Chain A
Amino acid sequence: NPAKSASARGSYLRVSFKNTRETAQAINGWELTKAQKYLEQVLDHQRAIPFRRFNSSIGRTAQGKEFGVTKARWPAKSVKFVQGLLQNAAANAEAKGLDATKLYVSHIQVNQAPKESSPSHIELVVTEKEEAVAKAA
């Protein structure tokens, strides 16, 4: 339901496409708080991003073991854009009058932009996770 979601686009972004595909997918379907915290931890080298498609010559680390992968890296610039976005999406939702505590990145998505440059659009979309229910006899 659109009355429940807030989106935040960003376009023509001078970021490596390939890295973004990763940090996005990494964060796909996470409770916004646990999600934002995780991007701090990649910044501090606590946790790494499970690179999966575009991953040739990524040096294996234990931090990959969290996910199911051996290869994983810490990319700054990418994530810098993605938490920049999430921060925005959060604020959109607060204008829309939502519960931020239930929130989660329902659909994030990244596709290339016009061009040498290699720029890239991003659109993440966050949603209230709907619960709260009861019955009678």
Chain B
Amino acid sequence: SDEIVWQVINQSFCSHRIKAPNGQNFCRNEYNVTGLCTRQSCPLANSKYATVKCDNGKLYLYMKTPERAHTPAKLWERIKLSKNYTKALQQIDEHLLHWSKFFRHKCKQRFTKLTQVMITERRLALREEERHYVGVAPKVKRREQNRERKALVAAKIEKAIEKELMDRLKSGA
């Protein structure tokens, strides 16, 4: 069934749960709406099930009917969602016609957060940051620490200045 898929995956292993320290669970099934592994939130127990995903910048509304349970390849049934957030919400509400207010809303929600993450462009236009992360490998953090101690020692700056002071102020009098 499903009520027999759930209670098996629910306890007795849904090999893609993350136990937060919090206690909270997280179905990492790249398809669910709420990241949390919960009945009527896991795309595995529940048989009617929608979501938004992105692919490129293209945000699709994937839907999973229970007709298609026979045939796991043509399981999801996606739709490009316009890209004016205003029409897009209306776009969404159209398809959700007569589903659980859960999806009906939690999808509107996903849709938003994913859209308000087209704020990568906001990081990538106002980039030009003269910083960039550098890895410190602990080999280097020796060759470049134990070799200075040796340079200093082999330098002996005093005897060098002593030279290039006397040797200066013997030809600049």
Contacts and interface: CB of A to CB of B under 8 A. Distances in A.
- For this complex, into which size category does the number of interface residues on chain A fall? under 10
A114 interface: no
Interface of A: 2-4, 97
B121 interface: no
Interface string B131-173: 0000000000000000001001101111100000000000000
Contacts of A2: 149, 152-153
A11 to B, nearest CB: 22
Interface of B: 149, 152-153, 155-159
A112 B152 CA distance: 32
Contacts, number: 11
Contacts of A4: 158
- A3, A4, A97 pick with most chain B CB within 10 angstroms: A3
Contacts of B156: 3
Nearest to B154: A3
Nearest to B149: A2
B71 to A, nearest CB: 77
A4 B155 CA distance: 12
A97 B153 contact: no
Nearest to B156: A3
A3 B148 CA distance: 13
A109 to B, nearest CB: 20
Given A3-B153, A97-B159, 9 more contacts: A2-B149, A2-B152, A2-B153, A3-B152, A3-B155, A3-B156, A3-B157, A3-B158, A4-B158
A93 B93 CA distance: 88
- B155, B156, B159 pick with most chain A CB within 10 angstroms: B156
B29 to A, nearest CB: 61
Pairs A-B, 6 closest by C-beta atoms: A3-B156, A2-B153, A3-B158, A3-B157, A2-B152, A3-B152
Nearest to A96: B156
A4 B153 CA distance: 10
A3 B159 CA distance: 10
A84 B62 CA distance: 87
Contacts of B152: 2-3
Nearest to B153: A2
